[PDB]
mmCIF file of N, CA and C and ligand atoms in Angstrom:
data_model
loop_
_atom_site.group_PDB
_atom_site.id
_atom_site.type_symbol
_atom_site.label_atom_id
_atom_site.label_comp_id
_atom_site.label_asym_id
_atom_site.label_seq_id
_atom_site.Cartn_x
_atom_site.Cartn_y
_atom_site.Cartn_z
ATOM 1 N N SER A 16 51.986 37.044 144.077
ATOM 2 C CA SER A 16 52.150 35.823 144.941
ATOM 3 C C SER A 16 51.073 35.794 146.015
ATOM 4 N N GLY A 17 50.603 34.599 146.344
ATOM 5 C CA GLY A 17 49.648 34.415 147.444
ATOM 6 C C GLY A 17 49.035 33.038 147.416
ATOM 7 N N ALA A 18 48.903 32.424 148.583
ATOM 8 C CA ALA A 18 48.360 31.060 148.721
ATOM 9 C C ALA A 18 47.309 31.017 149.836
ATOM 10 N N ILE A 19 46.238 30.260 149.610
ATOM 11 C CA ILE A 19 45.289 29.861 150.681
ATOM 12 C C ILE A 19 45.850 28.611 151.339
ATOM 13 N N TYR A 20 45.981 28.643 152.666
ATOM 14 C CA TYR A 20 46.381 27.501 153.520
ATOM 15 C C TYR A 20 45.218 27.128 154.438
ATOM 16 N N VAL A 21 44.521 26.060 154.090
ATOM 17 C CA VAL A 21 43.420 25.476 154.908
ATOM 18 C C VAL A 21 43.775 23.993 155.095
ATOM 19 N N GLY A 22 43.315 23.353 156.169
ATOM 20 C CA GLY A 22 43.653 21.947 156.447
ATOM 21 C C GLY A 22 45.067 21.635 155.981
ATOM 22 N N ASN A 23 45.246 20.530 155.258
ATOM 23 C CA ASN A 23 46.592 20.051 154.838
ATOM 24 C C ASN A 23 46.800 20.381 153.352
ATOM 25 N N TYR A 24 46.335 21.565 152.940
ATOM 26 C CA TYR A 24 46.222 22.010 151.528
ATOM 27 C C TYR A 24 46.801 23.419 151.370
ATOM 28 N N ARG A 25 47.593 23.605 150.315
ATOM 29 C CA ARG A 25 48.046 24.921 149.808
ATOM 30 C C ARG A 25 47.355 25.144 148.468
ATOM 31 N N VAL A 26 46.552 26.199 148.346
ATOM 32 C CA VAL A 26 45.849 26.573 147.084
ATOM 33 C C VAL A 26 46.622 27.720 146.442
ATOM 34 N N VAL A 27 46.865 27.639 145.142
ATOM 35 C CA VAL A 27 47.605 28.700 144.417
ATOM 36 C C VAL A 27 46.971 28.911 143.054
ATOM 37 N N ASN A 28 47.198 30.082 142.479
ATOM 38 C CA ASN A 28 47.164 30.244 141.018
ATOM 39 C C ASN A 28 48.010 29.108 140.500
ATOM 40 N N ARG A 29 47.557 28.463 139.427
ATOM 41 C CA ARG A 29 48.257 27.328 138.767
ATOM 42 C C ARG A 29 49.454 27.877 137.983
ATOM 43 N N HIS A 30 49.339 29.098 137.444
ATOM 44 C CA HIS A 30 50.391 29.751 136.619
ATOM 45 C C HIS A 30 51.554 30.209 137.510
ATOM 46 N N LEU A 31 51.381 30.188 138.835
ATOM 47 C CA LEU A 31 52.423 30.580 139.824
ATOM 48 C C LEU A 31 52.772 29.395 140.730
ATOM 49 N N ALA A 32 52.319 28.185 140.377
ATOM 50 C CA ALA A 32 52.532 26.944 141.158
ATOM 51 C C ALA A 32 53.993 26.507 141.016
ATOM 52 N N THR A 33 54.627 26.112 142.124
ATOM 53 C CA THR A 33 56.071 25.752 142.159
ATOM 54 C C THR A 33 56.248 24.252 141.866
ATOM 55 N N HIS A 34 57.476 23.846 141.533
ATOM 56 C CA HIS A 34 57.872 22.428 141.318
ATOM 57 C C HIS A 34 57.455 21.598 142.539
ATOM 58 N N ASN A 35 57.548 22.190 143.732
ATOM 59 C CA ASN A 35 57.086 21.570 144.996
ATOM 60 C C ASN A 35 55.566 21.344 144.959
ATOM 61 N N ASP A 36 54.804 22.378 144.573
ATOM 62 C CA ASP A 36 53.327 22.315 144.413
ATOM 63 C C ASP A 36 52.908 21.142 143.499
ATOM 64 N N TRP A 37 53.644 20.937 142.404
ATOM 65 C CA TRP A 37 53.373 19.877 141.393
ATOM 66 C C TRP A 37 53.807 18.504 141.923
ATOM 67 N N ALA A 38 54.951 18.442 142.616
ATOM 68 C CA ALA A 38 55.437 17.231 143.313
ATOM 69 C C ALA A 38 54.371 16.713 144.306
ATOM 70 N N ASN A 39 53.626 17.602 144.972
ATOM 71 C CA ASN A 39 52.561 17.245 145.956
ATOM 72 C C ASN A 39 51.184 17.705 145.447
ATOM 73 N N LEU A 40 51.000 17.766 144.123
ATOM 74 C CA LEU A 40 49.714 18.081 143.455
ATOM 75 C C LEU A 40 48.592 17.256 144.083
ATOM 76 N N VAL A 41 47.539 17.903 144.578
ATOM 77 C CA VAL A 41 46.273 17.229 144.988
ATOM 78 C C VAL A 41 45.272 17.333 143.847
ATOM 79 N N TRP A 42 45.127 18.526 143.304
ATOM 80 C CA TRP A 42 44.113 18.771 142.257
ATOM 81 C C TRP A 42 44.503 20.039 141.523
ATOM 82 N N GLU A 43 44.350 20.013 140.201
ATOM 83 C CA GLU A 43 44.615 21.168 139.319
ATOM 84 C C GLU A 43 43.448 21.250 138.324
ATOM 85 N N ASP A 44 42.992 22.465 138.038
ATOM 86 C CA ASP A 44 42.018 22.782 136.962
ATOM 87 C C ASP A 44 42.599 23.926 136.133
ATOM 88 N N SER A 45 43.203 23.598 134.988
ATOM 89 C CA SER A 45 43.829 24.579 134.060
ATOM 90 C C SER A 45 42.847 25.732 133.812
ATOM 91 N N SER A 46 41.569 25.401 133.589
ATOM 92 C CA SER A 46 40.504 26.363 133.207
ATOM 93 C C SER A 46 40.108 27.294 134.357
ATOM 94 N N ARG A 47 40.404 26.940 135.607
ATOM 95 C CA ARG A 47 40.075 27.756 136.807
ATOM 96 C C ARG A 47 41.284 28.570 137.290
ATOM 97 N N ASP A 48 42.448 28.379 136.650
ATOM 98 C CA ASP A 48 43.776 28.881 137.094
ATOM 99 C C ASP A 48 44.090 28.420 138.524
ATOM 100 N N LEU A 49 43.612 27.252 138.942
ATOM 101 C CA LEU A 49 43.787 26.797 140.345
ATOM 102 C C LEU A 49 44.605 25.519 140.384
ATOM 103 N N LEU A 50 45.587 25.506 141.280
ATOM 104 C CA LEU A 50 46.270 24.284 141.761
ATOM 105 C C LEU A 50 46.090 24.239 143.272
ATOM 106 N N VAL A 51 45.977 23.018 143.787
ATOM 107 C CA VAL A 51 46.016 22.678 145.234
ATOM 108 C C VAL A 51 47.099 21.622 145.388
ATOM 109 N N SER A 52 47.988 21.800 146.365
ATOM 110 C CA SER A 52 49.042 20.829 146.762
ATOM 111 C C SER A 52 48.808 20.391 148.219
ATOM 112 N N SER A 53 49.303 19.206 148.586
ATOM 113 C CA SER A 53 49.416 18.732 149.986
ATOM 114 C C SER A 53 50.480 19.545 150.725
ATOM 115 N N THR A 54 50.225 19.855 151.996
ATOM 116 C CA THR A 54 51.220 20.436 152.940
ATOM 117 C C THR A 54 51.444 19.425 154.069
ATOM 118 N N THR A 55 52.546 19.587 154.815
ATOM 119 C CA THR A 55 52.886 18.821 156.050
ATOM 120 C C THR A 55 52.209 19.470 157.266
ATOM 121 N N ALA A 56 52.062 20.799 157.258
ATOM 122 C CA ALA A 56 51.368 21.610 158.287
ATOM 123 C C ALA A 56 49.862 21.661 157.998
ATOM 124 N N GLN A 57 49.053 21.849 159.051
ATOM 125 C CA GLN A 57 47.615 22.240 158.974
ATOM 126 C C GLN A 57 47.562 23.723 158.607
ATOM 127 N N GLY A 58 46.451 24.203 158.052
ATOM 128 C CA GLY A 58 46.233 25.629 157.739
ATOM 129 C C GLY A 58 45.151 26.228 158.617
ATOM 130 N N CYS A 59 45.270 27.522 158.945
ATOM 131 C CA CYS A 59 44.333 28.262 159.841
ATOM 132 C C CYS A 59 43.273 29.046 159.040
ATOM 133 N N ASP A 60 43.458 29.212 157.719
ATOM 134 C CA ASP A 60 42.460 29.843 156.802
ATOM 135 C C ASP A 60 41.168 29.007 156.787
ATOM 136 N N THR A 61 40.044 29.704 156.639
ATOM 137 C CA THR A 61 38.681 29.130 156.563
ATOM 138 C C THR A 61 38.135 29.464 155.176
ATOM 139 N N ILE A 62 37.444 28.535 154.522
ATOM 140 C CA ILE A 62 36.863 28.787 153.173
ATOM 141 C C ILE A 62 35.403 29.173 153.378
ATOM 142 N N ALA A 63 35.021 30.371 152.937
ATOM 143 C CA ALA A 63 33.618 30.833 152.896
ATOM 144 C C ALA A 63 32.735 29.795 152.175
ATOM 145 N N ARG A 64 31.645 29.383 152.827
ATOM 146 C CA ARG A 64 30.539 28.595 152.232
ATOM 147 C C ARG A 64 29.283 29.457 152.319
ATOM 148 N N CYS A 65 28.976 30.127 151.198
ATOM 149 C CA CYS A 65 28.091 31.313 151.059
ATOM 150 C C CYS A 65 27.982 31.670 149.578
ATOM 151 N N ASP A 66 27.110 32.616 149.215
ATOM 152 C CA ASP A 66 27.108 33.245 147.863
ATOM 153 C C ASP A 66 27.033 34.765 148.033
ATOM 154 N N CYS A 67 27.850 35.277 148.950
ATOM 155 C CA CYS A 67 28.248 36.704 149.011
ATOM 156 C C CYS A 67 28.695 37.178 147.631
ATOM 157 N N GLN A 68 28.358 38.423 147.321
ATOM 158 C CA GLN A 68 28.885 39.111 146.127
ATOM 159 C C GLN A 68 29.544 40.417 146.555
ATOM 160 N N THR A 69 29.876 40.537 147.839
ATOM 161 C CA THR A 69 30.677 41.658 148.388
ATOM 162 C C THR A 69 31.746 41.119 149.337
ATOM 163 N N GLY A 70 32.949 41.683 149.240
ATOM 164 C CA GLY A 70 34.150 41.182 149.923
ATOM 165 C C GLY A 70 35.216 42.245 150.046
ATOM 166 N N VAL A 71 36.397 41.853 150.521
ATOM 167 C CA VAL A 71 37.651 42.656 150.584
ATOM 168 C C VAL A 71 38.742 41.817 149.911
ATOM 169 N N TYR A 72 39.409 42.349 148.897
ATOM 170 C CA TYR A 72 40.611 41.710 148.330
ATOM 171 C C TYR A 72 41.854 42.524 148.701
ATOM 172 N N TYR A 73 42.995 41.834 148.804
ATOM 173 C CA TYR A 73 44.313 42.464 149.015
ATOM 174 C C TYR A 73 44.957 42.794 147.668
ATOM 175 N N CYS A 74 45.266 44.070 147.458
ATOM 176 C CA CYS A 74 45.981 44.541 146.254
ATOM 177 C C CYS A 74 47.405 44.876 146.674
ATOM 178 N N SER A 75 48.361 44.025 146.287
ATOM 179 C CA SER A 75 49.791 44.157 146.664
ATOM 180 C C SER A 75 50.398 45.296 145.858
ATOM 181 N N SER A 76 49.893 45.532 144.643
ATOM 182 C CA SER A 76 50.358 46.630 143.757
ATOM 183 C C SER A 76 49.902 48.003 144.299
ATOM 184 N N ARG A 77 49.039 48.010 145.321
ATOM 185 C CA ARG A 77 48.604 49.225 146.052
ATOM 186 C C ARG A 77 48.943 49.084 147.533
ATOM 187 N N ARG A 78 49.402 47.914 147.953
ATOM 188 C CA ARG A 78 49.500 47.522 149.381
ATOM 189 C C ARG A 78 48.233 47.973 150.116
ATOM 190 N N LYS A 79 47.062 47.769 149.509
ATOM 191 C CA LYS A 79 45.721 48.162 150.021
ATOM 192 C C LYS A 79 44.739 46.970 149.947
ATOM 193 N N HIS A 80 43.763 46.960 150.849
ATOM 194 C CA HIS A 80 42.568 46.093 150.814
ATOM 195 C C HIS A 80 41.442 46.946 150.264
ATOM 196 N N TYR A 81 40.699 46.391 149.321
ATOM 197 C CA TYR A 81 39.619 47.091 148.603
ATOM 198 C C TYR A 81 38.335 46.307 148.819
ATOM 199 N N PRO A 82 37.280 46.963 149.340
ATOM 200 C CA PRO A 82 35.949 46.373 149.328
ATOM 201 C C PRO A 82 35.461 46.386 147.873
ATOM 202 N N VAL A 83 34.671 45.394 147.482
ATOM 203 C CA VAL A 83 34.290 45.159 146.069
ATOM 204 C C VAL A 83 32.952 44.428 146.041
ATOM 205 N N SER A 84 32.090 44.820 145.103
ATOM 206 C CA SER A 84 31.039 43.963 144.507
ATOM 207 C C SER A 84 31.697 43.060 143.453
ATOM 208 N N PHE A 85 31.364 41.776 143.425
ATOM 209 C CA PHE A 85 31.881 40.855 142.382
ATOM 210 C C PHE A 85 30.737 40.012 141.830
ATOM 211 N N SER A 86 30.921 39.566 140.585
ATOM 212 C CA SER A 86 29.969 38.753 139.791
ATOM 213 C C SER A 86 29.892 37.345 140.373
ATOM 214 N N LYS A 87 28.939 36.569 139.893
ATOM 215 C CA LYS A 87 28.777 35.164 140.319
ATOM 216 C C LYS A 87 29.809 34.372 139.535
ATOM 217 N N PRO A 88 30.435 33.316 140.104
ATOM 218 C CA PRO A 88 31.451 32.562 139.365
ATOM 219 C C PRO A 88 30.870 32.131 138.009
ATOM 220 N N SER A 89 31.584 32.401 136.915
ATOM 221 C CA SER A 89 31.134 32.104 135.531
ATOM 222 C C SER A 89 32.297 31.718 134.613
ATOM 223 N N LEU A 90 31.919 31.258 133.421
ATOM 224 C CA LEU A 90 32.824 31.042 132.268
ATOM 225 C C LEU A 90 32.943 32.384 131.539
ATOM 226 N N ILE A 91 34.008 33.112 131.848
ATOM 227 C CA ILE A 91 34.281 34.466 131.309
ATOM 228 C C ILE A 91 35.498 34.334 130.409
ATOM 229 N N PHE A 92 35.576 35.127 129.333
ATOM 230 C CA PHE A 92 36.762 35.220 128.441
ATOM 231 C C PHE A 92 37.766 36.215 129.047
ATOM 232 N N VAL A 93 39.040 35.812 129.108
ATOM 233 C CA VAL A 93 40.162 36.596 129.708
ATOM 234 C C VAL A 93 41.158 36.942 128.598
ATOM 235 N N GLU A 94 41.515 38.225 128.474
ATOM 236 C CA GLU A 94 42.428 38.755 127.424
ATOM 237 C C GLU A 94 43.841 38.195 127.627
ATOM 238 N N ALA A 95 44.749 38.509 126.697
ATOM 239 C CA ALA A 95 46.195 38.194 126.763
ATOM 240 C C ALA A 95 46.788 38.805 128.036
ATOM 241 N N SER A 96 47.819 38.158 128.584
ATOM 242 C CA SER A 96 48.458 38.508 129.878
ATOM 243 C C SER A 96 49.982 38.518 129.715
ATOM 244 N N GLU A 97 50.626 37.373 129.968
ATOM 245 C CA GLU A 97 52.105 37.193 130.029
ATOM 246 C C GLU A 97 52.409 35.861 130.725
ATOM 247 N N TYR A 98 51.536 35.479 131.716
ATOM 248 C CA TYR A 98 51.568 34.178 132.442
ATOM 249 C C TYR A 98 50.547 33.202 131.837
ATOM 250 N N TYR A 99 49.851 33.607 130.771
ATOM 251 C CA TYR A 99 48.781 32.823 130.095
ATOM 252 C C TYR A 99 48.519 33.378 128.697
ATOM 253 N N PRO A 100 47.817 32.610 127.831
ATOM 254 C CA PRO A 100 47.260 33.143 126.590
ATOM 255 C C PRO A 100 45.876 33.762 126.837
ATOM 256 N N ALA A 101 45.343 34.506 125.864
ATOM 257 C CA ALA A 101 43.919 34.912 125.818
ATOM 258 C C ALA A 101 43.073 33.633 125.777
ATOM 259 N N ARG A 102 42.162 33.460 126.739
ATOM 260 C CA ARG A 102 41.501 32.155 127.012
ATOM 261 C C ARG A 102 40.182 32.362 127.758
ATOM 262 N N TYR A 103 39.391 31.291 127.867
ATOM 263 C CA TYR A 103 38.175 31.196 128.716
ATOM 264 C C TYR A 103 38.560 30.605 130.076
ATOM 265 N N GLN A 104 38.305 31.350 131.156
ATOM 266 C CA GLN A 104 38.563 30.892 132.544
ATOM 267 C C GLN A 104 37.217 30.707 133.245
ATOM 268 N N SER A 105 36.945 29.502 133.749
ATOM 269 C CA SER A 105 35.719 29.138 134.507
ATOM 270 C C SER A 105 35.849 29.481 136.000
ATOM 271 N N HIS A 106 34.737 29.348 136.726
ATOM 272 C CA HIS A 106 34.634 29.602 138.189
ATOM 273 C C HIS A 106 35.392 30.901 138.518
ATOM 274 N N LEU A 107 35.141 31.939 137.706
ATOM 275 C CA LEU A 107 35.811 33.262 137.755
ATOM 276 C C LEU A 107 34.792 34.363 138.017
ATOM 277 N N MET A 108 35.185 35.274 138.897
ATOM 278 C CA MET A 108 34.332 36.381 139.369
ATOM 279 C C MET A 108 35.038 37.706 139.079
ATOM 280 N N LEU A 109 34.334 38.609 138.398
ATOM 281 C CA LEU A 109 34.861 39.944 138.051
ATOM 282 C C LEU A 109 34.320 40.961 139.054
ATOM 283 N N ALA A 110 35.182 41.909 139.414
ATOM 284 C CA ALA A 110 34.858 43.131 140.173
ATOM 285 C C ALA A 110 35.606 44.305 139.543
ATOM 286 N N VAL A 111 35.036 45.496 139.633
ATOM 287 C CA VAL A 111 35.734 46.727 139.175
ATOM 288 C C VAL A 111 36.801 47.004 140.238
ATOM 289 N N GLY A 112 38.071 46.913 139.838
ATOM 290 C CA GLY A 112 39.207 47.086 140.756
ATOM 291 C C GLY A 112 40.543 46.914 140.059
ATOM 292 N N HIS A 113 41.615 47.345 140.736
ATOM 293 C CA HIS A 113 43.004 47.286 140.217
ATOM 294 C C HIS A 113 43.522 45.858 140.379
ATOM 295 N N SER A 114 44.114 45.332 139.316
ATOM 296 C CA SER A 114 44.755 43.998 139.296
ATOM 297 C C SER A 114 45.870 43.995 138.233
ATOM 298 N N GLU A 115 47.115 43.876 138.699
ATOM 299 C CA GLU A 115 48.317 43.640 137.868
ATOM 300 C C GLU A 115 48.680 42.159 137.920
ATOM 301 N N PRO A 116 49.555 41.669 137.012
ATOM 302 C CA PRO A 116 49.972 40.266 137.025
ATOM 303 C C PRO A 116 50.443 39.772 138.402
ATOM 304 N N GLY A 117 51.294 40.556 139.070
ATOM 305 C CA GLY A 117 51.849 40.198 140.388
ATOM 306 C C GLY A 117 50.847 40.240 141.546
ATOM 307 N N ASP A 118 49.609 40.711 141.336
ATOM 308 C CA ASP A 118 48.529 40.725 142.359
ATOM 309 C C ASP A 118 47.858 39.352 142.479
ATOM 310 N N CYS A 119 48.116 38.427 141.558
ATOM 311 C CA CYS A 119 47.583 37.048 141.611
ATOM 312 C C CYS A 119 47.930 36.400 142.959
ATOM 313 N N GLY A 120 46.964 35.696 143.561
ATOM 314 C CA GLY A 120 47.117 35.068 144.876
ATOM 315 C C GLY A 120 46.749 36.023 145.981
ATOM 316 N N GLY A 121 46.506 37.283 145.648
ATOM 317 C CA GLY A 121 45.777 38.187 146.553
ATOM 318 C C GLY A 121 44.501 37.500 146.997
ATOM 319 N N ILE A 122 44.231 37.439 148.298
ATOM 320 C CA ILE A 122 42.987 36.755 148.763
ATOM 321 C C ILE A 122 41.807 37.734 148.698
ATOM 322 N N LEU A 123 40.666 37.273 148.182
ATOM 323 C CA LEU A 123 39.345 37.942 148.310
ATOM 324 C C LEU A 123 38.610 37.284 149.466
ATOM 325 N N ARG A 124 37.926 38.048 150.323
ATOM 326 C CA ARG A 124 37.286 37.456 151.526
ATOM 327 C C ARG A 124 36.113 38.288 152.062
ATOM 328 N N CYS A 125 35.122 37.579 152.604
ATOM 329 C CA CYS A 125 33.871 38.059 153.238
ATOM 330 C C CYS A 125 33.847 37.604 154.703
ATOM 331 N N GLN A 126 32.715 37.824 155.400
ATOM 332 C CA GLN A 126 32.551 37.517 156.849
ATOM 333 C C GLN A 126 32.669 36.001 157.053
ATOM 334 N N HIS A 127 32.376 35.216 156.003
ATOM 335 C CA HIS A 127 32.324 33.728 156.014
ATOM 336 C C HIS A 127 33.699 33.088 155.770
ATOM 337 N N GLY A 128 34.727 33.893 155.514
ATOM 338 C CA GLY A 128 36.106 33.414 155.295
ATOM 339 C C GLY A 128 36.572 33.651 153.868
ATOM 340 N N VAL A 129 37.549 32.880 153.412
ATOM 341 C CA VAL A 129 38.164 33.085 152.071
ATOM 342 C C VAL A 129 37.156 32.678 150.994
ATOM 343 N N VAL A 130 36.963 33.578 150.028
ATOM 344 C CA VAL A 130 36.117 33.399 148.816
ATOM 345 C C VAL A 130 36.979 32.973 147.624
ATOM 346 N N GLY A 131 38.155 33.574 147.435
ATOM 347 C CA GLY A 131 38.913 33.385 146.190
ATOM 348 C C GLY A 131 40.244 34.091 146.206
ATOM 349 N N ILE A 132 41.030 33.910 145.153
ATOM 350 C CA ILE A 132 42.340 34.575 144.945
ATOM 351 C C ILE A 132 42.267 35.328 143.618
ATOM 352 N N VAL A 133 43.010 36.446 143.522
ATOM 353 C CA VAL A 133 43.127 37.257 142.271
ATOM 354 C C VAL A 133 43.776 36.347 141.237
ATOM 355 N N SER A 134 43.205 36.342 140.038
ATOM 356 C CA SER A 134 43.613 35.475 138.904
ATOM 357 C C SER A 134 43.867 36.322 137.649
ATOM 358 N N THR A 135 42.936 37.228 137.330
ATOM 359 C CA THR A 135 42.926 38.071 136.111
ATOM 360 C C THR A 135 42.849 39.538 136.532
ATOM 361 N N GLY A 136 43.056 40.453 135.593
ATOM 362 C CA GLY A 136 43.153 41.895 135.868
ATOM 363 C C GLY A 136 43.196 42.713 134.592
ATOM 364 N N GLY A 137 43.017 44.027 134.726
ATOM 365 C CA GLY A 137 43.257 45.016 133.662
ATOM 366 C C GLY A 137 41.996 45.307 132.883
ATOM 367 N N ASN A 138 41.971 46.481 132.250
ATOM 368 C CA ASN A 138 40.756 47.209 131.806
ATOM 369 C C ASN A 138 39.999 47.652 133.058
ATOM 370 N N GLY A 139 40.700 47.950 134.151
ATOM 371 C CA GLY A 139 40.066 48.429 135.394
ATOM 372 C C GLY A 139 39.163 47.374 136.028
ATOM 373 N N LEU A 140 39.410 46.089 135.754
ATOM 374 C CA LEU A 140 38.687 44.975 136.405
ATOM 375 C C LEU A 140 39.693 44.100 137.161
ATOM 376 N N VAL A 141 39.195 43.371 138.170
ATOM 377 C CA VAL A 141 39.928 42.288 138.886
ATOM 378 C C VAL A 141 39.109 40.986 138.860
ATOM 379 N N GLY A 142 39.726 39.911 138.347
ATOM 380 C CA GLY A 142 39.192 38.542 138.278
ATOM 381 C C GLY A 142 39.674 37.699 139.444
ATOM 382 N N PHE A 143 38.736 37.079 140.157
ATOM 383 C CA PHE A 143 39.006 36.145 141.273
ATOM 384 C C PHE A 143 38.542 34.749 140.892
ATOM 385 N N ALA A 144 39.450 33.776 141.038
ATOM 386 C CA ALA A 144 39.182 32.324 140.976
ATOM 387 C C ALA A 144 38.454 31.918 142.254
ATOM 388 N N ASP A 145 37.162 31.617 142.129
ATOM 389 C CA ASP A 145 36.295 31.140 143.236
ATOM 390 C C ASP A 145 36.878 29.821 143.756
ATOM 391 N N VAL A 146 36.755 29.558 145.064
ATOM 392 C CA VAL A 146 37.141 28.271 145.726
ATOM 393 C C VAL A 146 36.034 27.778 146.678
ATOM 394 N N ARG A 147 34.822 28.331 146.628
ATOM 395 C CA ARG A 147 33.795 28.074 147.660
ATOM 396 C C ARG A 147 32.982 26.822 147.286
ATOM 397 N N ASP A 148 33.111 26.332 146.054
ATOM 398 C CA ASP A 148 32.428 25.108 145.562
ATOM 399 C C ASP A 148 33.286 23.884 145.889
ATOM 400 N N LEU A 149 34.585 24.082 146.126
ATOM 401 C CA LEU A 149 35.516 23.006 146.550
ATOM 402 C C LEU A 149 35.225 22.656 148.008
ATOM 403 N N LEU A 150 34.176 21.883 148.284
ATOM 404 C CA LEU A 150 33.802 21.550 149.685
ATOM 405 C C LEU A 150 34.889 20.674 150.335
ATOM 406 N N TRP A 151 35.647 19.960 149.504
ATOM 407 C CA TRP A 151 36.611 18.928 149.942
ATOM 408 C C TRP A 151 37.827 19.553 150.626
ATOM 409 N N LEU A 152 37.971 20.888 150.591
ATOM 410 C CA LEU A 152 39.083 21.611 151.275
ATOM 411 C C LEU A 152 38.868 21.593 152.795
ATOM 412 N N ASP A 153 37.616 21.432 153.259
ATOM 413 C CA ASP A 153 37.202 21.616 154.680
ATOM 414 C C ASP A 153 37.204 20.327 155.488
ATOM 415 N N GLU A 154 37.590 19.194 154.901
ATOM 416 C CA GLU A 154 37.942 17.965 155.665
ATOM 417 C C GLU A 154 39.216 17.368 155.064
ATOM 418 N N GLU A 155 40.035 16.736 155.918
ATOM 419 C CA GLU A 155 41.358 16.121 155.600
ATOM 420 C C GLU A 155 42.175 17.051 154.681
HETATM 421 O O1 T63 B 30 56.244 24.103 135.366
HETATM 422 C C1 T63 B 30 56.870 23.195 136.170
HETATM 423 C C2 T63 B 30 56.324 22.819 137.381
HETATM 424 N N1 T63 B 30 56.633 21.661 137.981
HETATM 425 C C3 T63 B 30 57.517 20.878 137.342
HETATM 426 C C4 T63 B 30 57.891 19.597 137.998
HETATM 427 C C5 T63 B 30 58.561 18.601 137.288
HETATM 428 C C6 T63 B 30 58.882 17.396 137.891
HETATM 429 C C7 T63 B 30 58.540 17.165 139.205
HETATM 430 C C8 T63 B 30 57.884 18.138 139.922
HETATM 431 C C9 T63 B 30 57.561 19.347 139.327
HETATM 432 N N2 T63 B 30 58.100 21.156 136.167
HETATM 433 C C10 T63 B 30 57.764 22.320 135.598
HETATM 434 ZN ZN1 ZN B 31 30.455 35.034 152.406
#
């Protein structure tokens, strides 16, 4: 579990998005594992506008923050899971790190603010759904 709260927006893994999230759907990309919903509250999170390839992600399955090198957002193939089929996920960044299914929504972040949320995992890798190209999160 984990959500980015910026402006009047809640960002989630789409595979963990609630009936409420869908009722107030702003934008969804099945291929990015990303949903964004409208909120009534403003958010205090800031979205990194940068091309950092080093960050800190929260691993709930370790209750630890891990510094990581990560790849540039790409169209990468993702193996079978349980919350998804074996599929191609876009705007996805891989780092060598621990990621279980329940670590999804773990925030990845650099000095510039939030970079992404944990989306994929296993084979000793962690996949993050990039959100830094979504410029529209930073107004209204
Ligand atoms: O996977 C589910 C997520 N959301 C909904 C949903 C249905 C009607 C209105 C709002 C939400 N259903 C199923
Ligand atoms: Zn950055």
